[PDB]
Write a protein that binds this ligand. Structure first.
Ligand SMILES: Nc1nc2c(ncn2[C@@H]2O[C@H](COP(=O)(O)O[C@H]3[C@@H](O)[C@H](n4ccc(=O)[nH]c4=O)O[C@@H]3CO)[C@H]3CC(O)(O)C[C@H]32)c(=O)[nH]1
Ligand SMILES: [Cl-]
Length: 396
């Protein structure tokens, strides 16, 4: 059987089943979740977790909203911090520590992001960080060091693009790629508690990408993931989630490198955007289903489950104990990229945890970024539009 077929047979024989709704469509992230659940389900006397794929993360949020409307929610689901904020408006989530899950040793960065009015409502589960993916062969070919600064990165992309006759820094015109440039030019989304999308650092970040396209060193990827477009033209670099690691490794027909992000100066790496999700437990669940969730979340935070999940995927281990586990240690010793992903996870920024942030990042800010990059809209005009649409949505 496939792991999901094994899970189906475990759950059919179980006396209690806690549904976990997720947004892994496939690859290593889906297999790793399913392998974790198969192992959990073996340890239990007829108390199982049933993972239900709901599409991607946006389809998962839509399906969770319809579940509220329908009067029936799963026991558990994946949720970004902004989705926790939304589910909290409807009082829909159980505080994790009251459930009895032990959070000692969980990354403080990750714990802070799931803490709302001093109460933790999520267990950090699959937490990614952005890294610099690069073509080791093509940088060696032209004698280009891995860039350590934003200045070096831009200089490197121009040098390589000129030598190879095509733009070598590949990017998605989206909020996630925008965040990298915005944060590392000194930007912040909140000024005195107010969301600001059109600050000078935002204009500067979107201007840098637009100018990169015009000058021929930046290539907008508009169909598929960057790793699904490799092999069409010279590639030197992308800034992308750590959870893309297995997809890049399988796709690349070159020696793939991973580095820490280019920063303002060599004093420290640039900040990466933390993405991925937490698990949350719904108040609607039965006492028996809640007790399955408590055991499952304890298993998830066990050092071995962390070590296997993180090394299989490129997600960041969420516990200090994961790094002390021999399976983690053995993988890091044979693959210096796990340690690089972990080192980068120390230089980590978050987007706003606002209930409306899903809509804003994709439909408002993402659209301004696409207008400027794909339709040459003026960056300030595009972001001023985004800012007005965001203020109208927040006052609604
Ligand atoms: N709803 C909602 N989504 C959000 C929020 N903040 C960021 N994002 C999205 O999270 C993805 C990052 O989450 P992460 O778990 O790090 O990475 C994903 C996938 O990105 C990545 N993947 C999958 C296939 C592939 O060929 N390559 C690949 O890299 O693997 C993981 C599992 O799907 C961004 C990118 C996106 O997938 O297109 C959509 C963006 C938010 O606040 N809300
Ligand atoms: Cl976006």
């Amino acid at each position: 059987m496939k792991p999901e077929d094994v899970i189906k047979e475990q759950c059919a024989r179980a006396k209690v089943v806690a549904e976990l709704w997720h947004g892994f469509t496939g690859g290593a992230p889906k297999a790793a979740l399913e392998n974790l659940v198969v192992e959990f389900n073996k340890a239990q006397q007829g108390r199982c977790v049933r993972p239900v794929p709901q599409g991607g993360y946006r389809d998962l949020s839509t399906k969770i909203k319809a579940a509220f409307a329908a009067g029936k929610v799963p026991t558990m689901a994946q949720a970004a911090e902004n989705n926790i904020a939304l589910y909290l408006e409807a009082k829909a989530l159980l505080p994790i520590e009251s459930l009895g899950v032990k959070l000692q040793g969980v990354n403080l960065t990750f714990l802070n992001a799931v803490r709302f009015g001093g109460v933790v409502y999520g267990v950090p589960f699959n937490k990614s960080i952005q890294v610099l993916y690069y073509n080791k062969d093509l940088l060696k070919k032209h004698g280009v060091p891995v860039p350590a600064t934003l200045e070096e990165f831009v200089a490197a992309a121009k040098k390589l693009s000129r030598a190879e006759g095509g733009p070598v820094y590949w990017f998605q015109p989206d909020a996630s790629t925008f965040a990298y440039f915005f944060f590392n030019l000194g930007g912040s989304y909140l000024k005195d508690g107010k969301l600001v999308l059109n600050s000078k650092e935002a204009v500067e970040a979107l201007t840098l990408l637009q100018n990169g396209v015009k000058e021929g060193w930046a290539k907008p990827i508009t169909s598929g993931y960057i790793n699904q477009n490799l092999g069409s033209g010279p590639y030197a670099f992308s800034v992308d989630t750590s959870a893309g690691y297995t997809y890049y490794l399988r796709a690349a027909k070159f020696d793939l490198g991973v580095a820490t992000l280019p920063g303002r100066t060599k004093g420290q790496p640039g900040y990466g955007l933390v993405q991925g999700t937490n698990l949350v437990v719904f108040r609607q669940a039965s006492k028996e289903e809640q007790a399955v969730a408590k055991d499952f979340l304890e298993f998830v935070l066990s050092p071995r489950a962390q070590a296997v999940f993180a090394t299989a995927t490129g997600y960041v281990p969420v516990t200090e104990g994961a790094l002390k586990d021999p399976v983690y240690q053995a993988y890091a010793a044979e693959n210096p990229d796990y340690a690089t992903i972990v080192r980068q996870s120390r230089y980590a920024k978050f987007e706003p945890a606002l209930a409306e942030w899903e809509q804003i990042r994709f439909d408002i800010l993402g659209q301004a970024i696409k207008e400027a990059i794909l339709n040459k809209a003026d960056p300030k005009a595009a972001l001023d539009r985004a800012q007005k649409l965001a203020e109208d949505l927040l006052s609604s």
